């Protein structure tokens, strides 16, 4: 199926407490493979996946270099953004950036992106055509104009349609055992006793990859979306994910309820019943 390579950058200013915090993580699909933490000992881009580990010195020196560059721009940006908004020196503010590339089942470029936020909110973004921008507000306009004048979008398009997708492909091979795998959910049902006339019926999805999943509870074949407790997809910490959905059943009515699991690691959708 389709695949992605995404880099996530978080810049946090620390008025008084040294330089700003800079974090950079990289993902291929739902699997992180590298990290940089302005606080960490190394000051290098580091591995976080077993496959990227034997990449080479040239690769690690190059990536270390660029993430240190990304870092600088972001320290600078922090100052520039305080000015655009006439914000005070003592304020602690956030900047986030995400960029990456997708390829289809054919491994050919599909789409690219570059998202930038200030204070957990849209600041400026590359449009889907990779030539123009969408500046959220009046302050972001100045950046829009700046990058437009500097053909920033062309060299960005160059990377996302070339180096990005061609490297995603490289990684998909370097860790084809990790990245070309799907762990189908390990499912089951539990049944507790809330009171004497009610009971909790919980459907479980465990140890699955990738993250995308659908759990739905049904009464008499009729979806209970409005009466289901659905928790967000969390990480098992071992590279797989978990999830669960619960309904409250008027005792005896257990027969009427079924959990439905959809995951790409399944041949058929699963229909679970308490029986």
């Amino acid at each position: 199926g389709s695949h992605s390579m995404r880099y996530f950058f978080t810049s946090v200013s620390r008025p008084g407490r040294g330089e700003p915090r800079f974090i950079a993580v990289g993902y291929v699909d739902d699997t992180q493979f590298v990290r940089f933490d302005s606080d960490a000992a190394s000051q290098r881009m580091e591995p976080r996946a077993p496959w990227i580990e034997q990449e080479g010195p040239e690769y690690w020196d190059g990536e270390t270099r660029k993430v240190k560059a990304h870092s600088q721009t972001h320290r600078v940006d922090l100052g520039t953004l305080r000015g655009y908004y006439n914000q005070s020196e003592a304020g602690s503010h956030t900047v986030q950036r995400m960029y990456g590339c997708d390829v289809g089942s054919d491994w050919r470029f599909l789409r690219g992106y570059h998202q930038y936020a200030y204070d957990g909110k849209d600041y400026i973004a590359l449009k889907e055509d990779l030539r123009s921008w969408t500046a959220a507000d009046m302050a972001a306009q100045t950046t829009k104009h700046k990058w437009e004048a500097a053909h920033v979008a062309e060299q960005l398009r160059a990377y996302l349609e070339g180096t990005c997708v061609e490297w995603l492909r490289r990684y998909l091979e370097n860790g084809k055992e990790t990245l070309q795998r799907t762990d189908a959910p390990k499912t089951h049902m539990t049944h507790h006793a809330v009171s004497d006339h009610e009971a909790t019926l919980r459907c479980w999805a465990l140890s699955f990859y990738p993250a995308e999943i659908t759990l739905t509870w049904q009464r008499d074949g009729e979806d209970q979306t409005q009466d289901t407790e659905l928790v967000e997809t969390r990480p098992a910490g071992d590279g797989t994910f978990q999830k669960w959905a619960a309904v409250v059943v008027p005792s005896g009515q257990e027969q009427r309820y079924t959990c439905h699991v959809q995951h790409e690691g399944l041949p058929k959708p699963l229909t679970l019943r308490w029986e």
Partner: peptide
């Protein structure tokens, strides 16, 4: 593989 150049806002 990161983007080689990162322009300022």
């Amino acid at each position: 593989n990161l983007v080689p150049m990162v322009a300022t806002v």
